Design a protein around this ligand. Structure first.
Ligand code: CDL
Ligand code: CDL
Ligand code: PEE
Ligand code: PEE
Ligand code: PEE
Ligand code: 8Q1
Lengths: 606, 178, 128, 156, 98, 88
């Protein structure tokens, strides 16, 4: 047997071993987090081998190993797809998880439940691998709901805090809304195509109808937090910073884009769904970037940045470039995780302060953190030859060279400018200027765990784009012919955003005070979407669940019609029947009436 | 959160609270310390301009217009201290606060460790038991027949007395219990 | 002088913008003192049982008992069939049922008349 | 420990009944106000201000800190709706309807401009992409026994 | 304005009691009284799992048809097959536009 | 690790440092038990700024009802020690 299948299966299998030891005498020892981190590093090293096999000969495989059950003509079995997407995404996720666990060994050092925290992180990684490698829709749904449950348990990690529980339930709600579309797609594909597995679905749907693809798009909008169902991702920063770095920035939130990438053969054929996907991505990537440029919490800024990048991935899918979207997923993971790590380092060195208004001049006080964050922002902005550049700059050209909605193109360019704007905001308000933090300085970044974990992702943020781009086979037709002004547009708009944001930020040094604009209020309060959509629908639903469903119907009218009416009628009849005074003069006269009636009513017609 | 509230806030309290709130929001708007110092001195001058007004109708009208000014001009995203009610670490450690009565349910093997701690706990429990009736007596004598007007509690006025209703204040879990 | 803030159901009027806290009568102050007295006696009554060493168990709260009893068992004895109650019951309880019956019956009639004339493309529809 | 007379009863017709209800619910008779006497089942339960639990002072020493409630005080009929894990009625920087107009206008404008951009798309000045073997007729599904119409591409 | 004398006195007594309690929450030196290889990790966590999985896939999973299906290997002009030894012809005399 | 185990003397030192950095109050005259009104002749508005400065120094917020009462540096030190559970 060739080692490809064995190695791909063992990579995922060894990640479950530290979970089987969760009742052993290592889980009650302070060496458990290091044990988990070592297991993830070994898994990454093992997953590097099938990736080499694919880069060599393009080897791909599906493994149907366990037959779970058979319903009539439909067979459901545990099957894994080990195509380009799976074998390329697994090592990237393992690398990021290894860095983040090493980081969490330092960030969460004083937490009494750090062992539980490590097992929880590991549980999420297992569910994400199940989601990514799934070959049928049922196994995909298993991973889909597993990552959501792990996200719920990790957002509400500090369960004594009401806001964290509110955010975790908000995540569950917003994701169930898209779970509706996932289930719709499952039901449609099972009835119409008679299969849940990917191979059959591809065969039997040469020209896929609207409804399954619209269900898939709803599920993707829910998972990746697009404009309709966007607000849960920013609120998910209630969780500890490593949770934000792993789940809600680079790995879990790309599941919707991954779902639409897995079904790109069917989406190639439906123009309406591609248009809907492009428009949803465009409005998301603009709205979230617009909200980001006026935020003051650093985690909120990075969360809106990642939501805008997910919108950009959805735009790339909407113009029929699934491989470009997957490449951008892999690139974005590196520098977005490292940006969240740098933010966590700042927060820890400043006694758990997250507002940039209390971070002063850290450029020289935290030199390594400054270098890492500067390199990450440059990678995110599409600086030439960096990891970000090998995908994002190719996306902007692709939209420019396509039969595209004009408003979507304009929105994408404006969002590209706003990305540089909010990167400027972070750098300016966190690292430049004079200190604004309390006087008892605690700044210290000389922990080897922090330095090594950040440096490993720093090297990726620089070289991964060039390494990966030059080893993948060509999966598209390149745009070799452009007008010059259209080749340089991404850099031009990025530089324009840089200059405008820097000038508007330097304006804040002047000794003038004026009241804010209405546009600033709209941006800072997130388009008033949470202030309206988290108050009006919830209030009306919760008010009807009691006023009518419970009280008017269940407690009043359903009682009134069946049991209360019966009891009242029987009571009245009993009182009427039993209220005879006992005088024989009355009921012997009654007897006379009865006898007379019988003689004529029943006797006079025999 | 430690002092008992009063039936109402006086005019002086309201204007002081407005001053502090406006200064905090101004600091939220003016990120930099020199600019904040400049406009905070301007704010203090604006407050001092009517420091000794004796027309209570005029003072009330001025305070009301100041409130209307603040509500329009407030920062939509004011700075909050991390452990303050709106902050990012407000109730973060509440999951670690465990009441002390739980220690009564420890298995004797658990109590076999920490013998000194539990001897001290037994002394504390005996102290709490021995002074309860005196505290109840003190409360009944001191308070008015109708009932207590305010939530303020009296101190210990004799020698070997403890302040009434002290156990749960003293045996607070911690601010960083774990 | 400035754009005025108007309250709503889900965004209420702030205390500092409420004209009641700025037109104070002696009777208003007496009412506030009375409210403080009621709150204070309740606080003292709670703290006396709370701090009691002897007490073991749950302090029973009559307000919670009243709330749950009113929300469940006090509702039917205080119900009267009124035109508002009858109309709301009929609408909210009957209207959705016939709305959904009409929707589903229309959809299924369309589907069956399509099956009858052999134009649905039911190919590969083995499982139902 | 709670007698029968401490339980909620019917709507109070007279002032004396109201005085007794207010005493029962631990409120001032000038503050007590029942729900309007229609047949909705509210009875004598007090109608409290429709504020949420988030609006109450977080710097007070509540008996129940998480719920911001005091032992023995009257409980709002909709407390479980207002527990602050849920519906919030706190005052906002921008007044309600100011936010609704801006949000709805923004969404309507985005939808209208997306429709317009669909009407007037963006593209490059090129002809259709050309494919050799009858526009890949055999590859794009097959049917080899049809011999489709020649699609012919010439050099330009 | 400021503390009333009884308020300050009560605060002082409570503060002394609280400080004594917090001092009492401290542990003695003996207080936790408890009652009475080089590369081993890479074989119990990698070699053993890959032994079971390889045995499972080779002799059980591949016993059933179509359980492990691989994408057909790409064939290019000029390739030599290892099965039949067939040689693929080259690609038709390029225009050589260089 | 995290912040050191802050002690009573440290709280007093920082409070007196912040007070001595205030232009209104001279360093030689100021004492731990000095009343902000009788001893230093400071108005109510002035007092509010001292409380805010203490909040900025120690990084936590003191409630307005609690804040008004604090009239001596020793009172501020005791309040901070009670909040942070400082027993030496
Ligand atoms: C290269 C080829 C192309 C060249 C193009 C030409 C060159 C560029 C053209 C100019 C581009 C804009 C440049 C300036 C941007 C504005 C920045 C600014 O100063 O804001 C002032 C003011 C807010 O300032 P403030 O409140 O005083 O701030 C207080 C402090 O500064 C508070 O301080 P703070 O710390 O909170 O900071 C606030 C924050 C910023 O403060 C804000 O929150 C407001 C900023 C808004 C900027 C919005 C720009 C993009 C908007 C897209 C929206 C799409 C349409 C939406 C329409 C919705 C209608 C409902 O500051 C920043 O962080 C930086 C701001 C961003 C700077 C960089 C922006 C780059 C992107 C835009 C330029 C793109 C160029 C490339 C294009 C290439 C295309 C091929 O906002 C404005 O007045 C203008 C905002 C722009 C849109 C306004 C439109 C009017 C809205 C109502 C219209 C009427 C509607 C009627 C009803 C219709 C219903 C159907
Ligand atoms: C399809 C053919 C026709 C239909 C036939 C079926 C319908 C039968 C109707 C039965 C009505 C009696 C019970 C209901 C109301 C209660 C009586 C009463 O006084 O309240 C009246 C109530 C208001 O009066 P109220 O002064 O306010 O009363 C105050 C207290 O609540 C009430 O004051 P109270 O509590 O002091 O009650 C006084 C006393 C008074 O109790 C009674 O009223 C006795 C009534 C039972 C006689 C059954 C008559 C049915 C004849 C069918 C034959 C068909 C011929 C053609 O109550 C008792 O003591 C009864 C206790 C049990 C003793 C049982 C003795 C009777 C023997 C059993 C039945 C006899 C069968 C015949 C021979 C059997 C021998 C084998 O409403 C009325 O005024 C309605 C009166 C009559 C309405 C009948 C509706 C029939 C409409 C015909 C439609 C035809 C359409 C065309 C067809 C094609
Ligand atoms: C522990 C260490 C064991 C070390 C010694 C074992 C070495 C190899 C043992 C080989 C055993 C022989 C064997 O397994 O042969 C296949 C044998 C029987 O064939 P079936 O596929 O079940 O036939 C159809 C009946 N449903 O299958 C098995 O018993 C092993 C199955 C284990 C699968 C791996 C774990 C996956 C299951 C996890 C549960 C998930 C819940 C449901 C998932 C739904 C997915 C769509
Ligand atoms: C024509 C004849 C119709 C016969 C149909 C009989 C229906 C079966 C239900 C009979 C139950 C009658 C009970 C009744 O009316 O008692 C009234 C009673 C008076 O109190 P007492 O029981 O005397 O004791 C406490 C007072 N000191 O009031 C009550 O408390 C009622 C409590 C019991 C109600 C439970 C009834 C539940 C019925 C649900 C619907 C089904 C009813 C049966 C017919 C269904 C339709 C075909
Ligand atoms: C098909 C179904 C489509 C959905 C229809 C609307 C669903 C309405 C759901 C009603 C649920 C009410 C009960 C929830 C319990 C109350 C609750 O959750 O608390 C509110 C809670 C707390 O408020 P926060 O702002 O998070 O924090 C403030 C605290 N300081 O906030 C929430 O979680 C409310 C969430 C409600 C979301 C409803 C709006 C979503 C509707 C999206 C429609 C557009 C879909 C997008 C389609 C994209 C195309 C592919
Ligand atoms: C970003 C911020 C938004 C802008 C906010 C707008 C606020 C309005 C600006 C101007 C403020 C006013 O009008 S000022 C309010 C108008 N009325 C008065 O001032 C009445 C007289 N006050 C006294 O007599 C007291 O003594 C007292 C002065 C409190 C001192 O007390 P101490 O000395 O005993 O502590």
């Amino acid at each position: 047997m060739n080692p490809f299948a064995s190695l791909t299966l063992t990579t995922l299998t060894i990640l479950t071993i530290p979970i089987m030891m969760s009742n052993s005498n290592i889980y009650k020892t302070n060496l458990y987090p290091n044990y988990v981190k070592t297991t993830v590093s070994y898994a990454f090293t093992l997953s590097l081998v099938p990736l080499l096999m694919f880069m060599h000969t393009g080897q791909e495989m599906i493994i149907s190993n366990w037959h779970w059950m058979t319903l009539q003509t439909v067979e459901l079995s545990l099957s894994f797809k080990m195509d380009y997407f799976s074998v390329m995404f697994i090592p990237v996720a393992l690398f990021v998880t290894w860095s983040i666990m090493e980081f969490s060994m330092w960030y969460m050092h004083s937490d009494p439940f750090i062992n539980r925290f490590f097992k929880y992180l590991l549980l999420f990684l297992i569910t994400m691998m199940i989601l990514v490698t799934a070959n049928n829709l049922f196994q995909l749904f298993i991973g889909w709901e597993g990552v959501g449950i792990m996200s719920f348990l990790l957002i509400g990690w500090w369960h004594g805090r009401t806001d964290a529980n509110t955010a975790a339930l908000q995540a569950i709600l917003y994701n169930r809304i898209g779970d509706i579309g996932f289930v719709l797609s499952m039901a449609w594909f099972l009835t119409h195509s008679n299969a849940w597995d990917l191979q059959q679905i591809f065969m039997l749907n040469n020209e896929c109808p609207n409804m399954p693809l619209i269900g898939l798009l709803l599920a993707a909008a829910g998972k990746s937090a697009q404009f309709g169902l966007h607000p849960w991702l920013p609120s998910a920063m209630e969780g500890p910073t490593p949770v934000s770095a792993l789940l809600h920035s680079s790995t879990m939130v790309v599941a919707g884009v991954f779902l639409l990438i897995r079904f790109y053969p069917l989406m190639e054929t439906n123009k309406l769904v591609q248009t809907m996907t492009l428009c949803l991505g465009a409005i998301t990537t603009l709205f979230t970037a617009l909200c980001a440029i006026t935020q003051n919490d650093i985690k909120k800024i990075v969360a809106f940045s990642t939501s805008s990048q997910l919108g950009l991935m959805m735009v790339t899918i909407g113009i029929n470039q699934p491989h470009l979207a997957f490449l951008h997923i892999c690139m974005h993971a590196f520098f977005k995780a490292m940006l969240f790590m740098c933010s966590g380092s700042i927060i820890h060195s400043l006694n758990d302060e997250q507002d940039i208004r209390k971070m002063g001049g850290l450029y020289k006080a935290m030199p390594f953190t400054t270098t890492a964050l500067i390199i990450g922002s440059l990678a995110l902005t599409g600086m030439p030859y960096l990891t970000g550049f090998y995908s994002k700059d190719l996306i902007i050209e692709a939209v420019n060279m396509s039969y595209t909605n004009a408003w979507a193109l304009l929105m994408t360019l404006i969002a590209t400018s706003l990305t540089a704007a909010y990167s400027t905001r972070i750098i300016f308000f966190a690292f430049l200027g004079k200190p604004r933090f309390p006087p008892l300085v605690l700044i210290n970044e000389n922990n080897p765990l922090l330095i090594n974990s950040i440096k490993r992702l720093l090297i990726g943020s620089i070289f991964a784009g060039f390494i990966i781009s030059n080893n993948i086979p060509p999966m598209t037709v390149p745009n070799t012919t452009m007008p010059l002004y259209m080749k340089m547009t991404a850099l031009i708009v990025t530089i324009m955003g840089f200059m405008l944001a820097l000038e508007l930020n330097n304006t804040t040094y002047y000794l003038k005070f004026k009241y804010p604009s209405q546009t600033y209020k709209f941006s800072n309060m997130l388009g008033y979407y949470p202030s309206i959509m988290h108050r009006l629908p919830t209030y009306h639903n919760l008010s009807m669940s009691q006023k009518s469903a419970s009280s008017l119907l269940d407690l009043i009218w359903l009682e009134t019609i069946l049991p209360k009416t019966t009891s009242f009628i029987q009571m009245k009849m009993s009182i009427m029947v039993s209220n005879q005074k006992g005088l024989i003069k009355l009921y012997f006269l009654s007897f006379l009436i009865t006898i007379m009636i019988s003689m004529t009513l029943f006797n006079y017609h025999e | 959160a430690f002092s008992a509230p009063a039936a109402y806030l006086t005019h002086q309290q309201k204007v002081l609270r407005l001053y502090k709130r406006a200064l905090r929001h101004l600091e939220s708007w003016c990120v930099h310390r020199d600019k904040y110092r400049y406009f905070a001195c301007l704010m203090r001058a604006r407050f001092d301009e009517h420091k000794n007004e004796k027309d209570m109708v005029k003072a009330t009208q001025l305070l009301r217009q100041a409130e209307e000014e603040f509500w329009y001009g407030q920062h939509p995203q004011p700075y909050i201290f991390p452990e303050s009610p709106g902050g990012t670490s407000y109730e973060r450690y509440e999951c670690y606060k465990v009441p002390e009565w739980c220690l009564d349910d420890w298995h004797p093997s658990e109590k076999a460790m920490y013998p000194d701690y539990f001897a001290k706990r037994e002394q504390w429990k005996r102290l709490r038991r021995e002074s309860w009736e005196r505290e109840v007596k003190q409360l009944q004598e001191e308070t008015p027949p109708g009932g207590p007007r305010t939530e303020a509690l009296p101190p210990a006025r004799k020698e070997g007395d403890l302040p009434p209703l002290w156990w749960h204040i003293v045996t607070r879990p911690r601010e960083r219990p774990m | 002088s400035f754009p005025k803030y108007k309250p709503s159901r889900l965004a209420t009027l702030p205390a500092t913008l409420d004209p009641a806290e700025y037109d104070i009568s002696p009777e208003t102050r007496k009412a506030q003192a009375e409210r403080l007295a009621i709150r204070s006696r309740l606080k003292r009554e709670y703290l006396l049982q709370y701090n009691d060493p002897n007490r073991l168990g749950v302090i029973e709260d009559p307000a919670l008992i009243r709330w749950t009893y009113a929300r469940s068992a006090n509702i039917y004895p205080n119900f009267r069939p009124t035109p508002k109650t009858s109309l709301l019951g009929a609408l909210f309880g009957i209207g959705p049922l016939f709305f959904w019956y009409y929707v589903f019956k229309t959809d299924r009639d369309k589907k069956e008349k399509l099956i009858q004339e052999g134009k649905l493309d039911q190919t590969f529809n083995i499982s139902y | 420990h709670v007698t029968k007379d401490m339980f909620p009863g019917p709507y109070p017709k007279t002032p004396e009944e109201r005085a007794a209800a207010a005493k029962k619910y631990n409120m001032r008779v000038e503050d007590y106000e029942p729900y309007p006497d229609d047949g909705m089942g509210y009875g004598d339960y007090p109608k409290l201000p429709d504020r949420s639990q988030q609006e109450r002072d977080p710097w007070y020493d509540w008996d129940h800190p998480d719920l911001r409630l005091n032992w023995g005080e009257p409980i709002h009929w909709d407390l479980d709706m207002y527990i602050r894990n849920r519906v919030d009625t706190s005052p906002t920087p921008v007044s309600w309807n100011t936010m609704c107009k801006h949000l709805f206008g923004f969404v309507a404008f985005m939808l209208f401009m997306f429709w317009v951009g669909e009407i007037y798309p963006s593209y490059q000045p090129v002809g259709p992409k050309q494919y050799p073997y009858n526009d890949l007729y055999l590859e794009r599904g097959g049917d080899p026994t049809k011999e489709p119409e020649p699609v012919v591409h010439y050099e330009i | 304005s400021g503390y009333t004398p009884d308020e300050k006195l009560r605060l002082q007594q409570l503060r002394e009691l609280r400080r004594r309690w917090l001092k009492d929450q401290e542990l003695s030196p003996r207080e936790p009284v408890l009652p009475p290889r080089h590369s081993i990790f890479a074989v119990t966590h990698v070699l053993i799992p890959v032994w079971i999985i390889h045995y499972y896939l080779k002799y059980h999973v591949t016993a059933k048809p179509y359980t492990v299906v691989e994408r057909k290997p790409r064939i290019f002009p000029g390739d030599t097959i290892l099965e039949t030894g067939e040689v693929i012809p080259l690609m038709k005399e390029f225009p050589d536009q260089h | 690790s995290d912040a050191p185990p802050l002690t009573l003397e440290a709280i007093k030192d920082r409070v007196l440092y912040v007070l001595k950095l205030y232009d209104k109050i001279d360093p030689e005259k100021l004492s731990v038990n000095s009343h902000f009104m009788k001893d230093l002749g400071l108005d109510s508005l002035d007092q509010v700024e001292i409380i805010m400065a203490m909040e900025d120094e120690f990084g936590f917020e003191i409630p307005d009802i609690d804040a008004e009462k604090l009239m001596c540096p020793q009172e501020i030190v005791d309040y901070i020690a009670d909040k942070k559970d400082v027993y030496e």
